[PDB]
Amino acid sequence: QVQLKQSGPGLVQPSQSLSITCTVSGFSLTSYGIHWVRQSPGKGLEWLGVMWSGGITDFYAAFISRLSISRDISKSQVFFKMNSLQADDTAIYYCARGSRYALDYWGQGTSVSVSSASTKGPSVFPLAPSSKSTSGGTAALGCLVKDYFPEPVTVSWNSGALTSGVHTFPAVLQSSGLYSLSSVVTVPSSSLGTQTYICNVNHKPSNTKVDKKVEPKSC
Amino acid sequence: DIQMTQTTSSLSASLGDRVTISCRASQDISNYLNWYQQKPDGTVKLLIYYTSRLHSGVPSRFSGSGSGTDYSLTISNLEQEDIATYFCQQGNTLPPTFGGGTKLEIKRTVAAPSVFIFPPSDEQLKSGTASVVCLLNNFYPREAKVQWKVDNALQSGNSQESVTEQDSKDSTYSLSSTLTLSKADYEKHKVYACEVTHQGLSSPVTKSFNRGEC
């Protein structure tokens, strides 16, 4: 069974290098090429280069001075290195096996973020349900999870007891290099001020857990 | 390089529909055209190679056709597991080049957003800033316009939006818009409003709060 397993970092500081190892099984590097491809948000797949089956490399023109690709046949490893990463190098990076016609089996991908931001836990603030919530209808409430780094955070409601009607938004990366998101939930207006609502925020990278009670306001 | 173009970035279809994704090369590629699928979790698989050949394990509901410069991938009867992004790649001349991708989403009936506005918390205000949040909940299609008004007038260059991935159960989207001000600036206006335009609304919906009531 053909497998390609990537190892390497989730975070590279700007102007530092990215190294990824592709460890393969179920075939010999001497019989297949190992291609390196990335996918950036709002861009397609971009081919960076390859270690051909015979041991020679080919690099895309825009990377000729920044890339190194080598291999250790005995260890079934291909080594990728890209010098001096910048913001536009944030991407998912893949290795992929090349057979006669195509890239027939892919690695799982390495999500690489390029940032000088410091690790920072979020500030968590309530999004209070409206005092104008329709009587006998549906209300919304939530928590704002502001200015953290790096990804990810997880959010639960009432210690994971409440999952219906929850939307935890994808984070938005700010100019500052910090992330923010909200998590919201729709609940019966009839439950407001009888049922307790608490968002439970976990930021494992900063070892941060916050529980925030979300109470009704007067506006 | 041979430039590859997928003229449609996004396609909407219902489960069971026949779905065709087009790809064009800048020059004749003599049928050396491959198709890849990238799932939402980032995993990539080869589907089709050499225009029409199925890769091992790929369902025969996938097929491919074309020649010269023009190619397509067809899914004969669409399944949930096919909701993904599709890329073509020419295999004719080095270097390898890819199309821009075509993302599939599920087509469903129109659903107008439920709109909610949230004031800043007293906790946040104590720290010296004020975020106002507008939520558009459970709507379809994905396109929506949100405008911030303070005391019934506009705003630019100062908010951010986030949109959820399509809901697995009801095929809707939700959207947040967040406007963050200094506390000082927040305290200069009385009424905060979010105005929403969407295909399901015959006229815009505005939700508002009065800062002085909070």
Binding site: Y32, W52, I56, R100 | -
Partner: peptide, 10 residues
Amino acid sequence: QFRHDSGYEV
């Protein structure tokens, strides 16, 4: 075509 394994190009 180019071979995606060896890089051999016709």
